[PDB]
Paper text:
We constructed the IBV spike ectodomain (from IBV strain M41) in the pre-fusion state by replacing its transmembrane anchor and intracellular domain with a C-terminal GCN4 trimerization tag, followed by a His6 tag. We collected cryo-EM data on IBV spike ectodomain, calculated a density map at 3.93Å resolution, built an atomic model of the structure and refined it. The final structural model contains all of the residues from 21 to 1022 (except residues 702–710) as well as glycans N-linked to 20 sites. The overall structure of IBV spike ectodomain resembles the pre-fusion structures of coronavirus spikes from the α-, β-, and δ-genera. IBV S1-NTD takes the same galectin fold as the S1-NTDs from the other three coronavirus genera, but it contains unique structural features. Above the core structure are some loops that form a partial ceiling-like structure. The structure of IBV S1-CTD is significantly different from the structures of S1-CTDs from the other genera. Its core structure is a β-sandwich containing two β-sheet layers: one is five-stranded and antiparallel, and the other is two-stranded and parallel. Moreover, the additional structural motifs on the edge of the core structure are also diverse among different genera. In the IBV S1-CTD, two extended loops on the edge of the core structure function as putative receptor-binding motifs (RBMs) by potentially binding to an unknown receptor (see below). IBV S1 takes a cross-subunit quaternary packing mode where the S1-NTD and S1-CTD from different subunits pack together. As a result, the putative RBMs of IBV S1-CTD are partially concealed, disallowing their full access to the host receptor.
Residue numbers in the entry:
A (entry chain C): 836 to 883
B (entry chain A): 21 to 701, 711 to 1022
C (entry chain B): 596 to 701, 711 to 931
D (entry chain C): 452 to 499
Write the structure that this text describes.
Amino acid sequence: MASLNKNFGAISSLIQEIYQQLDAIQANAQVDRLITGRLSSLSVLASA
Amino acid sequence: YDSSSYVYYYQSAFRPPNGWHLHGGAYAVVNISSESNNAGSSPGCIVGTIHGGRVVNASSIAMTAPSSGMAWSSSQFCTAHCNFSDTTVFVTHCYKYDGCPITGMLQKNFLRVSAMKNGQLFYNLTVSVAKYPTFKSFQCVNNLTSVYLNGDLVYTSNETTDVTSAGVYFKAGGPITYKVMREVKALAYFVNGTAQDVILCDGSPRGLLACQYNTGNFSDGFYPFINSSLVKQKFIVYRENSVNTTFTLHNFTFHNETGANPNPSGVQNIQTYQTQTAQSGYYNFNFSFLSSFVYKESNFMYGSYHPSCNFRLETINNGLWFNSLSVSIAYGPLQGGCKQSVFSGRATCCYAYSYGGPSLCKGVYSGELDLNFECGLLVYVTKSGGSRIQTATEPPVITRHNYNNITLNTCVDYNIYGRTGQGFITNVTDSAVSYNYLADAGLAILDTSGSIDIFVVQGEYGLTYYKVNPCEDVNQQFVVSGGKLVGILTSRNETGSQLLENQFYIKITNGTRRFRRSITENVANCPYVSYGKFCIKPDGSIATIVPKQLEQFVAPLLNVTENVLIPNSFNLTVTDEYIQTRMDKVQINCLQYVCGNSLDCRDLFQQYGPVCDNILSVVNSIGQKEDMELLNFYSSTKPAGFNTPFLSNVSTGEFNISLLLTTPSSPRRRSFIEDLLFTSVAYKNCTAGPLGFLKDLACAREYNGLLVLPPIITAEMQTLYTSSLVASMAFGGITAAGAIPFATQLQARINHLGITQSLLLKNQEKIAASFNKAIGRMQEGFRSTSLALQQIQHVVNKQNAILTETMASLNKNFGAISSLIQEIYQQLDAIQANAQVDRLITGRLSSLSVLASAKQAEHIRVSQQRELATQKINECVKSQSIRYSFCGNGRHVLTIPQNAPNGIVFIHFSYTPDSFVNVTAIVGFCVKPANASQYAIVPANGRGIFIQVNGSYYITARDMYMPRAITAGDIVTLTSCQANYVSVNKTVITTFV
Amino acid sequence: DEYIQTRMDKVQINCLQYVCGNSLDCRDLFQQYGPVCDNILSVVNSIGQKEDMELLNFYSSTKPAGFNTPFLSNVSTGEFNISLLLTTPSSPRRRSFIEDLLFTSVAYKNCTAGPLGFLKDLACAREYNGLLVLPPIITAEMQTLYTSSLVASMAFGGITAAGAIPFATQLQARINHLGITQSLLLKNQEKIAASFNKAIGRMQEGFRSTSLALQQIQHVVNKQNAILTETMASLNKNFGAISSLIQEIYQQLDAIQANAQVDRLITGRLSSLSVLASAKQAEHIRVSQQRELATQKINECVKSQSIRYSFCGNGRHVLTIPQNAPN
Amino acid sequence: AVSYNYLADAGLAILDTSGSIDIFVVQGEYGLTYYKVNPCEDVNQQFV
Ligand SMILES: *[C@@H]1O[C@H](CO)[C@@H](O[C@@H]2O[C@H](CO)[C@@H](O[C@@H]3O[C@H](CO)[C@@H](O)[C@H](O)[C@H]3NC(C)=O)[C@H](O)[C@H]2NC(C)=O)[C@H](O)[C@H]1NC(C)=O
Ligand SMILES: *[C@@H]1O[C@H](CO)[C@@H](O[C@@H]2O[C@H](CO)[C@@H](O[C@@H]3O[C@H](CO)[C@@H](O)[C@H](O)[C@H]3NC(C)=O)[C@H](O)[C@H]2NC(C)=O)[C@H](O)[C@H]1NC(C)=O
Ligand SMILES: *[C@@H]1O[C@H](CO)[C@@H](O[C@@H]2O[C@H](CO)[C@@H](O[C@@H]3O[C@H](CO)[C@@H](O)[C@H](O)[C@H]3NC(C)=O)[C@H](O)[C@H]2NC(C)=O)[C@H](O)[C@H]1NC(C)=O
Ligand SMILES: *[C@@H]1O[C@H](CO)[C@@H](O[C@@H]2O[C@H](CO)[C@@H](O)[C@H](O)[C@H]2NC(C)=O)[C@H](O)[C@H]1NC(C)=O
Ligand SMILES: *[C@@H]1O[C@H](CO)[C@@H](O[C@@H]2O[C@H](CO)[C@@H](O)[C@H](O)[C@H]2NC(C)=O)[C@H](O)[C@H]1NC(C)=O
Ligand SMILES: *[C@@H]1O[C@H](CO)[C@@H](O[C@@H]2O[C@H](CO)[C@@H](O)[C@H](O)[C@H]2NC(C)=O)[C@H](O)[C@H]1NC(C)=O
Ligand SMILES: *[C@@H]1O[C@H](CO)[C@@H](O[C@@H]2O[C@H](CO)[C@@H](O)[C@H](O)[C@H]2NC(C)=O)[C@H](O)[C@H]1NC(C)=O
Ligand SMILES: *[C@@H]1O[C@H](CO)[C@@H](O[C@@H]2O[C@H](CO)[C@@H](O)[C@H](O)[C@H]2NC(C)=O)[C@H](O)[C@H]1NC(C)=O
Ligand SMILES: *[C@@H]1O[C@H](CO)[C@@H](O[C@@H]2O[C@H](CO)[C@@H](O)[C@H](O)[C@H]2NC(C)=O)[C@H](O)[C@H]1NC(C)=O
Ligand SMILES: *[C@@H]1O[C@H](CO)[C@@H](O[C@@H]2O[C@H](CO)[C@@H](O)[C@H](O)[C@H]2NC(C)=O)[C@H](O)[C@H]1NC(C)=O
Ligand SMILES: *[C@@H]1O[C@H](CO)[C@@H](O)[C@H](O)[C@H]1NC(C)=O
Ligand SMILES: *[C@@H]1O[C@H](CO)[C@@H](O)[C@H](O)[C@H]1NC(C)=O
Ligand SMILES: *[C@@H]1O[C@H](CO)[C@@H](O)[C@H](O)[C@H]1NC(C)=O
Ligand SMILES: *[C@@H]1O[C@H](CO)[C@@H](O)[C@H](O)[C@H]1NC(C)=O
Ligand SMILES: *[C@@H]1O[C@H](CO)[C@@H](O)[C@H](O)[C@H]1NC(C)=O
Ligand SMILES: *[C@@H]1O[C@H](CO)[C@@H](O)[C@H](O)[C@H]1NC(C)=O
Ligand SMILES: *[C@@H]1O[C@H](CO)[C@@H](O)[C@H](O)[C@H]1NC(C)=O
Ligand SMILES: *[C@@H]1O[C@H](CO)[C@@H](O)[C@H](O)[C@H]1NC(C)=O
Ligand SMILES: *[C@@H]1O[C@H](CO)[C@@H](O)[C@H](O)[C@H]1NC(C)=O
Ligand SMILES: *[C@@H]1O[C@H](CO)[C@@H](O)[C@H](O)[C@H]1NC(C)=O
Ligand SMILES: *[C@@H]1O[C@H](CO)[C@@H](O)[C@H](O)[C@H]1NC(C)=O
Ligand SMILES: *[C@@H]1O[C@H](CO)[C@@H](O)[C@H](O)[C@H]1NC(C)=O
Ligand SMILES: *[C@@H]1O[C@H](CO)[C@@H](O)[C@H](O)[C@H]1NC(C)=O
Ligand SMILES: *[C@@H]1O[C@H](CO)[C@@H](O)[C@H](O)[C@H]1NC(C)=O
Ligand SMILES: *[C@@H]1O[C@H](CO)[C@@H](O)[C@H](O)[C@H]1NC(C)=O
Ligand SMILES: *[C@@H]1O[C@H](CO)[C@@H](O)[C@H](O)[C@H]1NC(C)=O
């Protein structure tokens, strides 16, 4: 649960204000990194 | 490193630590040639003379000496120079006679490595005779023009010039060796920063393992590999058109023309001043628009909009696959050309080249169309992803040749549909003209990873279907066993003299040509390398495996009268096993492990707060959870104290058990058998003083932050545990009077299988001879074929291999530019380095996560075996329960535990007799008494079936042939008998007066 | 009933042929990823050896004496219809009825040509991506005699084969150990027959609808299939990259910009192999646990009839009969 | 280290892993020596 505010290689933690600060077609790399990190955290949960 | 097959060559004066490491340089040999005693009539070679050459035009040279023999003194060694096309390099130990201005006649002087052009001298450096003790080798390398007095650099310059001659003066000594060489890849094992040996990548079977898996001193087991080599018939299948075609690619050209005016205010008011389209077949695009046209990198408003089309415009001509394609050029504005002309426009994506244009251009955007901008040409491209047209550069060479002749069942190269592979091709259309195996769109089927599984071809009487499977060497293995290579376990048949299960087997020739084929031998058990009913020795030859099993008996189950087999004599068959019971606790210091000894890297680290808490909490939890119930396990089984050595000079009766217990003369409290266990495998001062080859990795661990903690049972508190446990097994019972330390326990424990206690003068030396033969088989069994030793080996190797990969995970850089962090900030920018440092720190904390998870899994394993250990200590040692074949493949008698590497080793003693007797048996009686009554007698439980001997009648136990008169308490009275009896007219109770 | 797993399919990851495809390139870029293939190979080699040694220990501790006799259930017993439970004469495989009912709910090939089935022919899709198997140290058609020899030692162990006693006398001399006598005749002989006939009637009713072994078979087979069939479908799943296949990364864009993409993709695929090796080691710990429980229950519940109350089968047990299963 | 040929004929430092220095050399005395670098007293302190 406390793995949500922990941002990955990114610029911020919440996803509502990633699209509001910078460009459209440059934000998708940031969003892909963040979603891949959160699904890695769920993989750790299921293995434990 | 001065052998007759390679020359070493130290990579630039620093040394990476103890382990294998790879390089690339001129290391091989070709044309080894010898030479000796290049001196005249003089008693010693005079210093400073440069003559004595030998013309060699090669890409290297090397002058090597015998192994550290040629000293620098008089009558032993002189100049030994190369020369390049114009410049020379000559060493000279110019000790004084009159000649050079050095003025020294002793050792502890210097040398002269000095270059020399046609008339003058430069680059005098004077290295001491210290750090260069003995002339070993001397190279001259082509590329970078550098020269190498043994090992490191002495001189470089600018040019790239090949060696033209070389030559050495010396009076006497070892015969010197000239050799030229080529450039290969090799890797060198070196400890303490000096080379021992190298492994070349010369296509040898020993070489390929090291060159692909980056290691030597390999583990045992299997290893896959490759050797790619193919110059054979390649065949190409192009995309067939309708009918009757010669595949000719069309040429679409472009040119900047005398264009029109720039556009007015509307984004529909920009006109494409060219148009082309793709229809079918092949194409290429001649773009001559690299001439002084810069590419504009995409950003927030202006530039290209190449997302949704990952290729750049100068890379269309490589092999792509589209579905419909049309490009066109248009001279619009620059700030809002693509970002408006993609969404509301007419293209999927567009590019934006620029040039020197006049700044009178009316831009297109909602509300901002009243300014003046630049006019760079912007090309359009309308991509739709698919497979209908293919773009290629060279014209296809299949010129009026319908596909009639392509090869089958041979390892070929193939380039079909623009995807290069390497395999062979079968014919599968018999199973595919049915089952509608492809639909009405007939082309290939991709599998995963972008290869081709089934494709089609057209042009014969009917269309066929071909399948692509890889070649014979897509997965070859070669078996290593113990310490060295044995043979290649392949899939092909190169006159392979042995067939294993579903794989063919060859064997590499080791010296002599013989020892290739033999008759297989039957092995009981083998721990070496096992592969599917076949076992491979380190000798090289295989031997088939077939497991043995021992006999057992439950034999008395008696219906109608017939003689039965019960044992009279008995033997003991030993059996060992090993159970792990302890664990080394760790303590990860994350701050000192991630960053090095630096002033920085820490302020960047202090926003990685909770991940060190997460990596610390699980290690702290497993440490506490192990350390509590380890003391529970110690306090549940340590019997009473009994702090008595019992050091095996105690006089027993006839049982030689002094082999199995501790000796008086030893520095450690250790018996013989666990010493044999130890020879197969926490108080230090880490600042100064080494101990050993393997225990002194603790200083390499503690300087990287992976330290250990002592257990709650201290050292020299577990070495009394085993002795106290066997002391309670022996002394427990008797009051120590009458020569009974170990014997009486065994005889009073062996007669529980029958039904008596502690019988004397019968069954006393039979037990002695049987137990002596049992310990003889025991002392034979450990060294060659046992069960505990290989378990010890696997457990010790896994416990070492957990931690020795999270130390060698430091030089392994992640997505980064280097491994160490001290020289990331020194090479590049400040605010660009932080992404690199974040990637590297995230990778190292991922490695610590892997370490903590592996440690928790190993703790679950050892807690499982520890609770099984306390159960077996509570039952098999001090109890002798009647559970059949719980411990030691039979109804067990006694066990003796011993020490081990972080475990305990049991020695079980079974009970399996073989010699039987042939005695007649009966199942019951029904005596009739005198006046009026009737009853039967059935033998009770736990007292065994009863037999007869030569007239009388006797009961006996079910395991020991021990005749005895029937008593009154072993009967069952029943008011029935059904002629399956004996029916004696007189009573057979044998009561007393 | 109950089911206990006791075996494991050994794997052999060929990392060089799994990461890159059939290409001339991708390999020179791969040859600086040296020790990570050694790390992914060593744990698989270790679990293979550690399974393959004590599997032969488990086979040599319980295979009773030989007894290489078929005992194919036309042997005339007294009144016990046990021919439902043992093997039949007319069958291509040495298989009884009940484990055939177990099998219908769920290593010699030539992969170059010739299919076999819908599910067994995934081995050619595995071997062309570098996830191949190895045969066990007990060979095929060496485990199908194991169950028959074990029930042959449970039946014939004892008598000297004279007097129509293949299976009955073992049961009557094992049932009177709860009281205190041995092998009583002409009382308690048909009562046991009627009770055991009703018991095998409830047994032949029980397997098809409501049993305990069948769903355990289902969950174990589905997990053993689902471990490997996600690390094959992890190939088309691209990582942070531009595409999935590696043949057409070098053809679309620049040379010195493609190497970051290729490094990300290769690091992702080696992470997937790390997940595979860790899952295989955890499953080996599971099967070693159930295998040592298996040798304990073979040593006690089959050949001994100990008096431990409700160890195996919810009461003071009489006799057990083992049968084959999926692994 | 004057025995055991503890460095070869190219005498400079030995890197360990993570880019630090384990053993280096120095020159200028009667004979060349060998020095070892180990971290300070507080490289791993703990508090319970
Ligand atoms: C690639 O093609 C471009 C379009 O054909 C060329 O750019 C053209 O250069 C002309 C010469 O400078 C310009 O003509 C002038 O335009 C201005 C308006 O900004 C008028 O006032 C001038 O009278 C007029 N000169 C005349 C009529 O002699 C074109 O306007 C200009 N086209 C544009 C900007 O779209 C490039 O020069 C050409 N590059 C090459 C050949 O390398
Ligand atoms: C892969 O297998 C295919 C299936 O057998 C082969 O295709 C066969 O080729 C034969 C010879 O070219 C054809 O036989 C001809 O059939 C016609 C009409 O049936 C007859 O008039 C001809 O006399 C006969 N030729 C003879 C008897 O010599 C088969 O019809 C054809 N089968 C098909 C298309 O399904 C492929 O040739 C084979 N691949 C290779 C490389 O050999
Ligand atoms: C680290 O240990 C080194 C090994 O002991 C020290 O090096 C030693 O220094 C001594 C004094 O400088 C030398 O003694 C001299 O040896 C010469 C020839 O052997 C004699 O002629 C001198 O009289 C003698 N000096 C005396 C007795 O005062 C040792 O030879 C020398 N050992 C070597 C080089 O192996 C280092 O000094 C020491 N480091 C520090 C910082 O002290
Ligand atoms: C190798 O280099 C040596 C050193 O320069 C060359 O020796 C010189 O040769 C020229 C003409 O051959 C003489 O004029 C010089 O006097 C020589 N040098 C000395 C110091 O005597 C030698 O020629 C070179 N080898 C070849 C094959 O050219
Ligand atoms: C390397 O050492 C030699 C020593 O011989 C230097 O040679 C001297 O050069 C100067 C200038 O050319 C002459 O005046 C001297 O007579 C030479 N010394 C002799 C012949 O003994 C040479 O200059 C040095 N190289 C340098 C400093 O680059
Ligand atoms: C690693 O491999 C090297 C081979 O280069 C081993 O070094 C040999 O060890 C034996 C053991 O006595 C010596 O007889 C040889 O002379 C050594 N050869 C060289 C070139 O030094 C080394 O022991 C291995 N290390 C292990 C297995 O830990
Ligand atoms: C590298 O340095 C170590 C440290 O001295 C050497 O290890 C010693 O080896 C000798 C064998 O001749 C043992 O007698 C010593 O006890 C070892 N020292 C220890 C354990 O501290 C090692 O031999 C060196 N490697 C070489 C010279 O190749
Ligand atoms: C129990 O006591 C008896 C009686 O002392 C021991 O029997 C003696 O055994 C030794 C060894 O064979 C003989 O030499 C003696 O003659 C025996 N004594 C007799 C017959 O009176 C017996 O060994 C003891 N049991 C032990 C020590 O385990
Ligand atoms: C896809 O191809 C396979 C391979 O032929 C087809 O599988 C065959 O199906 C038939 C009947 O369904 C069986 O008799 C064969 O034994 C199968 N062959 C195998 C498993 O190798 C499959 O039916 C095809 N799918 C279709 C036509 O939809
Ligand atoms: C043990 O032997 C007796 C023989 O006395 C067997 O008893 C026979 O049982 C069958 C089946 O009920 C009867 O038809 C016979 O008449 C019995 N024989 C007699 C009474 O003499 C008994 O079955 C045997 N036990 C076994 C085979 O387990
Ligand atoms: C090869 O060796 C022979 C040995 O006599 C020698 O004569 C010849 O010059 C050598 N060739 C080279 C070094 O190219
Ligand atoms: C290099 O040396 C060889 C030695 O025989 C000679 O044949 C060749 O002509 C030489 N090349 C030159 C001087 O360019
Ligand atoms: C070594 O020399 C060859 C000569 O062709 C050159 O191609 C190669 O780049 C050189 N290696 C270096 C400079 O590392
Ligand atoms: C290489 O460097 C030297 C150093 O002065 C110079 O004289 C020479 O011209 C250079 N070679 C070139 C530029 O090809
Ligand atoms: C691999 O191929 C090379 C090329 O011919 C060959 O020399 C080598 O023996 C092969 N390795 C084997 C068969 O292990
Ligand atoms: C132009 O196309 C023709 C075929 O239409 C082809 O022969 C020729 O090579 C092409 N020109 C090129 C590729 O420069
Ligand atoms: C593109 O067209 C120009 C026009 O002259 C020609 O010179 C050039 O060779 C062509 N490029 C090709 C065919 O790659
Ligand atoms: C392999 O080749 C040998 C020839 O030495 C042959 O005798 C053997 O039968 C072959 N193995 C096969 C066909 O499985
Ligand atoms: C069993 O014991 C007898 C007599 O004690 C002996 O002759 C025989 O060799 C033994 N068998 C073994 C140890 O296998
Ligand atoms: C056995 O060894 C101990 C060790 O000191 C000694 O005290 C004792 O006297 C020895 N027993 C003998 C010599 O009978
Ligand atoms: C026990 O066996 C060892 C093995 O060599 C022997 O040295 C010792 O004398 C024996 N002790 C006896 C027979 O009492
Ligand atoms: C142990 O290490 C300490 C650390 O300061 C040092 O003072 C002491 O001399 C060492 N003891 C030895 C080398 O015996
Ligand atoms: C016991 O002896 C009898 C007669 O001598 C024989 O028929 C029987 O087979 C023997 N039992 C054995 C050898 O087990
Ligand atoms: C039982 O089946 C076997 C297998 O063919 C046969 O040999 C035997 O005669 C059969 N028993 C009968 C028919 O009583
Ligand atoms: C045992 O039961 C099966 C089940 O149908 C039956 O076919 C067989 O005849 C029975 N055998 C007997 C009663 O001996
Ligand atoms: C088995 O595969 C080999 C591969 O070369 C082939 O030669 C052989 O004909 C195949 N056997 C069949 C399909 O029965």
